[model samples]
Target chain A: KQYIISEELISEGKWVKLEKTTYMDPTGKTRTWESVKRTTRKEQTADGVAVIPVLQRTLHYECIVLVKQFRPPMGGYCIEFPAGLIDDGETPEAAALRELEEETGYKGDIAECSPAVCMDPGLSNCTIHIVTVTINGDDAENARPKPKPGDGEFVEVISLPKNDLLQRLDALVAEEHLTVDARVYSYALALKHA
Target chain B: KQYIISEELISEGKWVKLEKTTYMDPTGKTRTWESVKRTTRKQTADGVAVIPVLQRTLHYECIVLVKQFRPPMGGYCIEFPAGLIDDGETPEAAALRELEEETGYKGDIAECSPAVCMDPGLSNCTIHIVTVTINGDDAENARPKPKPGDGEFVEVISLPKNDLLQRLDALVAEEHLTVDARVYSYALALKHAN
Candidate 1:
């Protein structure tokens, strides 16, 4: 009962564009919705990947690697998982590894991957793969991990114990006045509920 | 080291607008980022979602989910009942209202998350996740009926909490639908915790 009628461009920016979509609902009535689309998404299966790096310390303490970066869209420092857009012809797994390395300088193995999930279905056409990476905390290369963010990127890496992650996030918000990304927050909430 | 220099308007649509934000990085370099903002965000948040859990018995629990055609995703999205917050409405109120309208299940708010940014790299869209509990033993909930407004077509489904992750996966494969990141992450958390 749902079918698309037409899509017209509303506006275009350097990295994203807005469009108005006219579609038929189940009641046979036409409706219009405004949505945003990324311009750099080529023929990739997904737009990007958010890597959840789990540090397996030799001392038996497991933690999750997170990043704090200034997101211009939010106009604030946001604590989020290390993530990046997939390069053309690059697989989600490859993109996840490269972005984790580039952003946090930690080498790890892909442990699990989620199917492509929509970020904000009502607002944008953005989708991402959530990849879990297992990092050896005892590895020599990770001992003094250094981030090499691309131009205009500035990220600060932080590790928090996997236990009581939701409380830790709340503490960070209250003490450091940092915003948390929805995906990361949702994952943290999941950890608690699980 | 991170501060905004200026934000110049790139384009504006009926509901959203694109802007170019020039900011200074930690390396003392000036850069420009393109971001999208909702033109209608006037109050606490832009959107809200309610995660409704129904406990029919001590051992039987289920979550109420809604499936609808999301124009941006270009397909039906299996997600929690959600909607944009009306002007001056509290996030908790909006969550409850949307839940009843989309699923016909009136629930009591258990907890509400802080405002969280969705797709921080692409847009300023933020939403609060509200956890709600429904009394499945109540007579009114036995035959809940949705009252979707004009242009809305939603199908409600209840999945048992015990095997939610696998059940959601099976539903996705059978119905060829995509799931929202929040729901998927929560399901994954439940699986891991169990």
Candidate 2:
């Protein structure tokens, strides 16, 4: 098994940091790898939560709640699930619920929560929990959502039919030229393939 | 539509650069966001991941996965065979190459996904998910030998497709390893469909 020997800081920013890690490979070869990490991560907790809120409008008319926002990293608008960083000491379910309401203005029941998974393991140590949520559209509060996004957050909520989600996302990418988050796209593909 | 105004570099490393981008929101509010970007990204995808599905019979199938120490995560991570796209390389070509190099299995690309951004809030890195089919009945598949590059110490693993999610969960619990988000998402989707 490969083991890390040391991680030397290469650079640091307000939110992210870069490090050069030296490790020993199985053949006892010394090697170095460059990796990026989030500085806001808390110990023994996930860095963030990605909530997949399924809006049940009816028995057969369920939809998925998505959010479109301009991401500076992508330099354009991106189609993604309602997600946010986990606040200090917040549980994954609680963070998912809070982010869902703040970004899409919908309360949801946590159906399942995944263990923390690496976002980009080859490049960064950033990780998040993928939380499956069930949102009751019949609830009066969900009839007309009044999102309370944080300052500087200009998130636009979108609801797409669960049955034709992949097709809708494809159309959005082709028509609106918006980037789709990998996790969101993969989930849609899984729904179709499965 | 919101538009980016300027990006000022906050920190630069050998592989990554952090920037503070100023943009104009729909409400004419100017906001600044901290973002991380790769320095070696090409015009196309930055990386590629292959989902190697081995089919031994009409009803028997499994996926090829790899486990290795990730410096950023400070532990071993279970993930699909993946690597960065080399210069002048197509995503499909890169996927096939990485798959063979990391898992010692040659497969045909069944489908290639569109470029999808990973960790959009943190970095601009993107990758294409290439689904590949391996004929498990072939003599070459009888005894596959991984040829991980120098400094790459990947351990190959194959799990039955029917119970991938459960197997992954078991591995996580038994070995205390983290799973990649894309791998977990695909497994979850399969479980949901079943």
Listed in order, each prediction's TM-score against the native is 0.96, 0.95
User: What CA RMSD would you report for each candidate?
Assistant: 1.5, 1.7
Candidate 2 wrong stretches, greater than 4 Å: none
Over B81-182, each residue of candidate 1 has an lDDT whose tens digit, in order, gives 999999989999999899999998988998889988888888878889888999988888888878888778899989987788889889878988888888
- Kindly report the fnat of each predicted structure, to 2 decimals: 0.68, 0.64
Candidate 2 residue-wise lDDT, B1-194, digit = tens: 78889999887767778888888888998887788888888647788888899888766689889998887788899998999999999998998899989988888989888888888888878889888989888888778777877678788989988898899999988998999998888887677552
Question: In CAPRI terms, where does candidate 2 land?
Answer: medium
lDDT of 1 at B168: 84
CA lDDT of every candidate: 0.86, 0.86
Please give, for residues A58-166, the per-residue lDDT of candidate 1 as tens digits.
Answer: 8666888999999888888899999999999999999999999999999989988878889999888889888888999898988998888887678889898878778
Question: What is the alpha-carbon lDDT for the whole of candidate 1?
Answer: 0.86
